[PDB]
Amino acid sequence: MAAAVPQRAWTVEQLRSEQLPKKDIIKFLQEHGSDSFLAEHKLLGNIKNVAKTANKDHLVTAYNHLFETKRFKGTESISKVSEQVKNVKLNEDKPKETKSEETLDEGPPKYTKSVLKKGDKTNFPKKGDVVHCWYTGTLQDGTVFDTNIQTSAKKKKNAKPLSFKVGVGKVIRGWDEALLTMSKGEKARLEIEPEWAYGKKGQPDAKIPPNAKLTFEVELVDID
Protein backbone atom coordinates (compact mmCIF):
# COMPACT_ATOMS: atom_id res chain seq x y z
CA MET A 1 0.00 0.00 0.00
CA ALA A 2 1.20 3.50 -0.89
CA ALA A 3 -1.05 6.39 -1.91
CA ALA A 4 -1.54 9.25 0.55
CA VAL A 5 -3.39 12.52 -0.04
CA PRO A 6 -1.54 14.18 -2.98
CA GLN A 7 -0.98 17.93 -2.85
CA ARG A 8 -2.01 20.26 -5.68
CA ALA A 9 0.61 19.93 -8.41
CA TRP A 10 -0.89 22.48 -10.79
CA THR A 11 -2.69 25.80 -10.39
CA VAL A 12 -6.10 26.99 -11.60
CA GLU A 13 -4.30 29.70 -13.57
CA GLN A 14 -2.10 27.07 -15.22
CA LEU A 15 -4.63 24.32 -15.96
CA ARG A 16 -7.28 26.63 -17.43
CA SER A 17 -4.40 28.29 -19.29
CA GLU A 18 -3.66 27.49 -22.93
CA GLN A 19 -0.01 26.53 -22.35
CA LEU A 20 -0.55 23.40 -20.25
CA PRO A 21 -1.34 20.13 -22.11
CA LYS A 22 -4.68 18.61 -21.10
CA LYS A 23 -3.11 15.19 -21.71
CA ASP A 24 -1.34 15.47 -18.35
CA ILE A 25 -4.24 16.83 -16.29
CA ILE A 26 -6.10 13.70 -17.42
CA LYS A 27 -3.30 11.34 -16.42
CA PHE A 28 -2.97 13.08 -13.05
CA LEU A 29 -6.60 12.53 -12.07
CA GLN A 30 -6.35 8.92 -13.25
CA GLU A 31 -3.40 8.28 -10.92
CA HIS A 32 -4.78 10.42 -8.08
CA GLY A 33 -8.47 9.57 -8.38
CA SER A 34 -10.62 6.45 -8.31
CA ASP A 35 -12.53 5.01 -11.28
CA SER A 36 -15.89 5.95 -9.75
CA PHE A 37 -14.62 9.47 -9.14
CA LEU A 38 -13.49 9.78 -12.75
CA ALA A 39 -16.64 8.09 -14.07
CA GLU A 40 -18.60 11.05 -12.71
CA HIS A 41 -16.84 13.43 -15.10
CA LYS A 42 -16.04 10.65 -17.58
CA LEU A 43 -12.34 11.08 -16.85
CA LEU A 44 -11.60 7.35 -16.54
CA GLY A 45 -10.74 5.16 -19.50
CA ASN A 46 -8.39 6.35 -22.23
CA ILE A 47 -6.88 9.83 -21.94
CA LYS A 48 -6.51 10.16 -25.71
CA ASN A 49 -10.23 9.42 -25.90
CA VAL A 50 -11.05 11.48 -22.81
CA ALA A 51 -9.21 14.54 -24.13
CA LYS A 52 -12.00 14.80 -26.71
CA THR A 53 -14.91 14.35 -24.31
CA ALA A 54 -13.41 16.32 -21.43
CA ASN A 55 -13.04 20.07 -21.90
CA LYS A 56 -10.32 22.30 -20.45
CA ASP A 57 -12.41 23.49 -17.51
CA HIS A 58 -13.81 19.96 -17.30
CA LEU A 59 -10.39 18.59 -16.39
CA VAL A 60 -9.72 21.47 -14.00
CA THR A 61 -13.16 21.37 -12.40
CA ALA A 62 -12.60 17.69 -11.64
CA TYR A 63 -9.09 18.39 -10.34
CA ASN A 64 -10.34 21.03 -7.91
CA HIS A 65 -13.35 19.30 -6.38
CA LEU A 66 -11.34 16.07 -6.11
CA PHE A 67 -9.49 17.64 -3.19
CA GLU A 68 -12.60 19.26 -1.74
CA THR A 69 -14.51 15.97 -1.89
CA LYS A 70 -11.44 14.02 -0.74
CA ARG A 71 -12.41 11.25 -3.17
CA PHE A 72 -8.88 10.45 -4.34
CA LYS A 73 -7.92 7.07 -5.80
CA GLY A 74 -8.54 4.16 -3.44
CA THR A 75 -7.41 0.55 -3.12
CA GLU A 76 -8.35 -1.65 -6.08
CA SER A 77 -5.52 -4.06 -6.89
CA ILE A 78 -2.48 -2.98 -4.87
CA SER A 79 0.45 -5.37 -4.39
CA LYS A 80 -0.45 -9.06 -4.10
CA VAL A 81 1.80 -12.08 -4.62
CA SER A 82 -0.09 -14.70 -2.61
CA GLU A 83 -2.29 -15.37 0.42
CA GLN A 84 -1.57 -17.80 3.26
CA VAL A 85 -3.28 -18.42 6.60
CA LYS A 86 -1.48 -20.38 9.31
CA ASN A 87 -3.61 -22.60 11.54
CA VAL A 88 -3.29 -21.61 15.20
CA LYS A 89 -0.35 -19.22 15.53
CA LEU A 90 -1.55 -15.63 15.18
CA ASN A 91 1.07 -13.58 13.33
CA GLU A 92 0.77 -10.30 11.43
CA ASP A 93 -2.59 -8.81 10.43
CA LYS A 94 -1.75 -7.08 7.15
CA PRO A 95 -0.13 -8.57 4.01
CA LYS A 96 3.02 -6.55 4.68
CA GLU A 97 6.16 -7.09 2.60
CA THR A 98 6.77 -5.43 -0.77
CA LYS A 99 8.84 -7.86 -2.84
CA SER A 100 11.92 -5.64 -2.97
CA GLU A 101 14.08 -5.58 0.17
CA GLU A 102 16.81 -2.92 0.07
CA THR A 103 16.30 0.68 1.18
CA LEU A 104 19.65 1.33 2.87
CA ASP A 105 22.68 -0.25 4.53
CA GLU A 106 23.03 1.96 7.62
CA GLY A 107 19.31 2.28 8.30
CA PRO A 108 17.03 5.24 7.42
CA PRO A 109 15.33 7.40 10.11
CA LYS A 110 11.82 6.80 11.43
CA TYR A 111 10.18 8.26 8.32
CA THR A 112 10.20 8.26 4.52
CA LYS A 113 10.24 11.30 2.23
CA SER A 114 9.94 11.57 -1.55
CA VAL A 115 10.23 14.80 -3.54
CA LEU A 116 7.45 14.69 -6.14
CA LYS A 117 7.80 18.13 -7.71
CA LYS A 118 11.21 19.77 -7.29
CA GLY A 119 11.06 23.42 -6.26
CA ASP A 120 13.44 26.38 -6.00
CA LYS A 121 16.13 24.05 -4.67
CA THR A 122 17.94 26.98 -3.08
CA ASN A 123 15.68 28.69 -0.55
CA PHE A 124 15.55 26.20 2.31
CA PRO A 125 13.95 26.76 5.76
CA LYS A 126 16.44 27.98 8.36
CA LYS A 127 16.24 27.47 12.12
CA GLY A 128 14.23 30.36 13.53
CA ASP A 129 12.76 31.47 10.21
CA VAL A 130 9.03 31.03 9.59
CA VAL A 131 7.49 29.03 6.75
CA HIS A 132 4.14 28.86 4.96
CA CYS A 133 2.90 25.66 3.34
CA TRP A 134 -0.05 23.27 3.06
CA TYR A 135 -0.41 19.70 4.32
CA THR A 136 -2.91 16.85 4.03
CA GLY A 137 -2.64 13.99 6.49
CA THR A 138 -4.11 10.53 6.01
CA LEU A 139 -3.72 7.32 8.02
CA GLN A 140 -2.52 4.05 6.48
CA ASP A 141 -6.07 3.36 5.29
CA GLY A 142 -6.40 6.96 4.14
CA THR A 143 -8.03 8.33 7.29
CA VAL A 144 -7.81 12.13 7.21
CA PHE A 145 -6.50 13.38 10.56
CA ASP A 146 -5.38 16.88 9.55
CA THR A 147 -6.02 18.74 6.30
CA ASN A 148 -4.78 22.33 6.04
CA ILE A 149 -5.63 22.42 2.33
CA GLN A 150 -8.24 25.18 2.47
CA THR A 151 -10.43 26.21 -0.48
CA SER A 152 -9.01 28.34 -3.29
CA ALA A 153 -8.94 32.13 -2.96
CA LYS A 154 -9.86 32.66 -6.62
CA LYS A 155 -13.37 31.48 -5.72
CA LYS A 156 -13.46 33.15 -2.30
CA LYS A 157 -10.89 34.88 -0.09
CA ASN A 158 -10.54 32.22 2.60
CA ALA A 159 -7.19 30.48 2.17
CA LYS A 160 -3.98 31.12 4.11
CA PRO A 161 -1.05 28.64 4.42
CA LEU A 162 0.09 27.65 7.92
CA SER A 163 3.02 29.78 9.08
CA PHE A 164 5.43 28.18 11.55
CA LYS A 165 9.13 28.53 12.34
CA VAL A 166 11.34 25.54 11.55
CA GLY A 167 13.82 24.08 14.02
CA VAL A 168 11.88 25.60 16.91
CA GLY A 169 9.92 22.64 18.27
CA LYS A 170 6.96 23.80 16.19
CA VAL A 171 6.14 20.49 14.51
CA ILE A 172 6.98 16.82 15.06
CA ARG A 173 10.61 15.69 14.95
CA GLY A 174 9.84 13.62 11.87
CA TRP A 175 8.24 16.46 9.94
CA ASP A 176 10.91 18.96 10.99
CA GLU A 177 13.64 16.70 9.62
CA ALA A 178 11.72 16.23 6.38
CA LEU A 179 10.46 19.79 5.90
CA LEU A 180 13.93 21.10 6.75
CA THR A 181 14.98 19.62 3.40
CA MET A 182 12.04 21.16 1.52
CA SER A 183 12.62 23.95 -1.01
CA LYS A 184 10.66 27.07 -1.96
CA GLY A 185 7.81 26.04 -4.22
CA GLU A 186 8.18 22.27 -4.01
CA LYS A 187 5.80 19.35 -3.43
CA ALA A 188 6.66 16.20 -1.50
CA ARG A 189 5.11 13.12 0.09
CA LEU A 190 6.60 11.91 3.37
CA GLU A 191 5.39 9.19 5.74
CA ILE A 192 6.32 9.45 9.42
CA GLU A 193 6.23 6.40 11.67
CA PRO A 194 4.26 6.30 14.97
CA GLU A 195 7.57 6.69 16.81
CA TRP A 196 8.15 10.16 15.37
CA ALA A 197 4.55 11.42 15.47
CA TYR A 198 2.10 10.41 18.20
CA GLY A 199 3.75 7.29 19.58
CA LYS A 200 3.06 3.57 19.92
CA LYS A 201 -0.03 4.55 21.91
CA GLY A 202 -1.57 6.62 19.14
CA GLN A 203 -3.79 9.70 19.04
CA PRO A 204 -7.34 8.92 20.31
CA ASP A 205 -8.03 12.64 19.93
CA ALA A 206 -8.27 12.23 16.16
CA LYS A 207 -9.40 8.60 16.24
CA ILE A 208 -5.78 7.55 15.68
CA PRO A 209 -5.05 3.98 16.92
CA PRO A 210 -1.67 2.79 18.32
CA ASN A 211 1.21 2.44 15.86
CA ALA A 212 -0.37 4.25 12.91
CA LYS A 213 1.75 5.35 9.95
CA LEU A 214 1.02 8.95 8.93
CA THR A 215 1.59 9.84 5.28
CA PHE A 216 0.95 13.28 3.78
CA GLU A 217 2.07 15.85 1.22
CA VAL A 218 3.40 19.38 1.72
CA GLU A 219 3.72 22.40 -0.56
CA LEU A 220 6.04 25.25 0.43
CA VAL A 221 4.63 28.66 -0.51
CA ASP A 222 7.15 30.95 1.20
CA ILE A 223 9.87 31.16 3.85
CA ASP A 224 10.33 34.13 6.18
Curated annotation (Swiss-Prot):
Keywords: Acetylation, Isomerase, Nucleus, Phosphoprotein, Rotamase. GO terms for cellular component: nucleus. Residues 89-102 have a biased composition (Basic and acidic residues). Inhibited preferentially by rapamycin over FK506. It is found in: Nucleus. Its main location: nucleus. FK506- and rapamycin-binding proteins (FKBPs) constitute a family of receptors for the two immunosuppressants which inhibit T-cell proliferation by arresting two distinct cytoplasmic signal transmission pathways. PPIases accelerate the folding of proteins. This is Peptidyl-prolyl cis-trans isomerase FKBP3. It comes from Homo sapiens (Human).
